[PDB]
UniProtKB/Swiss-Prot annotation:
Protein location: Periplasm
Family from the record: Belongs to the bacterial solute-binding protein 5 family.
Biological process per Gene Ontology, one example term: peptide transport
Purpose: Involved in a nickel transport system, probably represents the nickel binder.
Organism of origin: Escherichia coli (strain K12)
GO cellular component: ATP-binding cassette (ABC) transporter complex, substrate-binding subunit-containing; membrane; outer membrane-bounded periplasmic space; periplasmic space
UniProt name for this protein: Nickel-binding periplasmic protein
Underlying gene: nikA
Keyword Transmembrane helix among record annotations: no
Sorted UniProt keywords: Nickel, Periplasm, Signal, Transport
Mitochondrion in keyword set: no
Pfam families assigned: SBP_bac_5
GO molecular function: heme binding; metal cluster binding; nickel cation binding; peptide transmembrane transporter activity; transition metal ion binding
Amino acid sequence: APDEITTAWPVNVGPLNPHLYTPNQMFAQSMVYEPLVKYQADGSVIPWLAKSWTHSEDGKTWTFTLRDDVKFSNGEPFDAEAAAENFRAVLDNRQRHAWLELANQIVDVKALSKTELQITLKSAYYPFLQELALPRPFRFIAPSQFKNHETMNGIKAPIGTGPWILQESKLNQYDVFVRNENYWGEKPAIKKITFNVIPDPTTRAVAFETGDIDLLYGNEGLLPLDTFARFSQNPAYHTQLSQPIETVMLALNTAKAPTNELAVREALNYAVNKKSLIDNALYGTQQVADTLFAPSVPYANLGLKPSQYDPQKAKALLEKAGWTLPAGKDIREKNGQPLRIELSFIGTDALSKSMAEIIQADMRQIGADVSLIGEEESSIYARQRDGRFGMIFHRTWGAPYDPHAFLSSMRVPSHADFQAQQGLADKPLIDKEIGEVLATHDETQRQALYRDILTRLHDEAVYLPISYISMMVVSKPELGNIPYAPIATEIPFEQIKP
Ligand SMILES: COc1cccc(CN(CCN(CC(=O)O)Cc2ccccc2SC)CC(=O)O)c1O
Ligand SMILES: [Cl-]
Ligand SMILES: [Cl-]
Ligand SMILES: [Cl-]
Ligand SMILES: [Fe+3]
C-alpha cells in the first residue's frame, strides 16, 4: 500500500521505556511519547501536552495547565496526576540523569488538579522548557504500565500519547509501528512503518537498491558517502542533504602527556587539512569546522580565530616547545621522549578508521607519531568515561542540546569532555561559570559567560574541530520531499506525505 513504508535502523528501537537510555532509540521514544512543550526550529517551544503555563517572579515555581482531551493509546486518560507520576518515576532514578541539569534542578512536582501541574525548581533554570522538550527522560507513559509503581526497573507495555504505536518487535530483525487512530492531534498520512534491522552501511545501501526498503534517514554514517553521491545523480532515486546539525571533532586530553602541553594541542590544530580530509574520507559532502560550535549556534558567534591548515606553523610551535627532530628521524623528541599520541576510535567503524588514517598521516608530516587504537564500542566508551585516551573522536549533540546542555555535561566526571579538560588550570573556573550561565537571567551576563567559556575552550585548544555534519536522506521518489525535525535526533515520520 502507498501509505505503508519500510525503512532501516542499525539496531532495534529497544523496549521503548520513556525514562531510560541505551538500548532505547531516541527517535522511536519520540514517536510514541510526547513532551509538555514541543521544541521549534527557531529555538522556542510551543504548547503541546501543556496548553499554557505561568511561573512565579523568582522563576522557581512553574504551573502548567494541561490539555483535557488527551488519552494514552490504551484509552486511559492523560492528566496532571499521570504526568506527576511520570516525573516521580524519572526522579526516583535521579542519579542516572546527572548529565541533564534539570534532573538536579527539580525540587518538587505535584498535580494541583486534573489540569494543573506544578513544578518547583532549585533555581531559576533558564533552559527549563527546552529540556522538558527533549526526547527523554521527561515524556509520559501510562502509569498503569509502571512496574511496581516505577519505570527505572522496567515497564509493561510502551503506552504513550503519541501519533505512533509500537505494533511488534523482533530482536535483531525488525520493529513495526502503526498510526495511532485515537491521537489527540493531527493524524499521520502514513499508516504503518517497518524498521528493518541492518547494522552495516553498505548493506543498507544494497537494501535500498534492491527495493527492500523505501527510505534511509540518518547522519553521515547512514550509508557510504561515495554511494550516496552516486545515488544523488541517479534519476530513479531521491536524495537530500540537510544544512549542518552538529560538530564532529577530536577531544584532546589536557591531562595526559604529551597533549597536556598547550603548544602541542595548538600545533595539532594547525596540522590537519580539514578540507582535504572531507574531500578524501567524506566524499566532499560535509563542511569544514574551525570551532567547537558553528557560528550559527546560539551564543556561539564570537569571532573566534580559526587555526587554518598550516604545517609550517605547526612545526614552529613544536620546535619552540622543545620538540625537535633527531638525526635521521621523522618523529620529534623532547627529553628523550618521542612525540607519540594515541588516537582511539571504534575499530569496526570504517568512516572513523578512514578519518583516523588521514589524521595520522597529516600529523606525521609535522613530526607527531599518532598510534591508532581501534577497539569495540564498549571499550571506547570506557575510555571516554575514565580519560584513558590521548585523542578521541567526539561530537556535539545538535539542537536543542547545543550549546547549553553539551556545556552543562562538561561538568560531569563520567563524560569525555570533563576528562579531556581535566588538566586545565582554569577547569574549576569553567565549571563554575557553566553552572552560572544556566541560572542567570541577566541576558548580558549570560552572553558574557558563554563567550568566556567557549573562548577559554578555544584558546586552550581542548578540541580539534573537524566538520559540521549534515542529515542525509535516500528515498523512493513517490515518498516525496522528506522534512527534517527541529530536534536533530528525531525523525518526523508524521510529516511525510506521499
Ligand atoms: C544520538 O545520541 C545523542 C544525541 C543527542 C544527545 C545525546 C546525549 N545524550 C546524553 C546522555 N547519554 C550519555 C551520552 O550520550 O554521553 C545517555 C546516557 C545517560 C545516562 C547514563 C548513561 C547513558 S549512555 C552511556 C542524550 C540522551 O542520550 O538522552 C546523545 O547521546
Ligand atoms: Cl539507562
Ligand atoms: Cl544505543
Ligand atoms: Cl506490577
Ligand atoms: Fe546520549
